[PDB]
Protein backbone atom coordinates (compact mmCIF):
# COMPACT_ATOMS: atom_id res chain seq x y z
CA UNK A 1 0.00 0.00 0.00
CA UNK A 2 1.05 3.77 -0.54
CA UNK A 3 2.23 3.82 3.19
CA UNK A 4 5.84 3.64 3.51
CA UNK A 5 6.55 5.55 0.37
CA UNK A 6 5.02 8.79 2.89
CA UNK A 7 4.82 9.13 6.54
CA UNK A 8 1.94 7.67 8.34
CA UNK A 9 -0.86 9.39 6.22
CA UNK A 10 -3.48 6.63 7.91
CA UNK A 11 -6.21 9.90 8.81
CA UNK A 12 -8.50 10.39 6.87
CA UNK A 13 -6.92 6.47 5.78
CA UNK A 14 -9.51 6.05 8.37
CA UNK A 15 -12.10 9.07 8.08
CA UNK A 16 -13.69 7.66 4.33
CA UNK A 17 -13.18 4.04 6.28
CA UNK A 18 -15.62 5.69 9.01
CA UNK A 19 -18.01 6.16 6.15
CA UNK A 20 -17.63 2.55 4.00
CA UNK A 21 -18.40 0.30 7.20
CA UNK A 22 -19.92 2.28 9.35
Known sequence: ???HI???I???GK???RLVTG
Open 1 to 3: FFH
Open 6 to 8: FRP
Open 10 to 12: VHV
Open 15 to 17: TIH
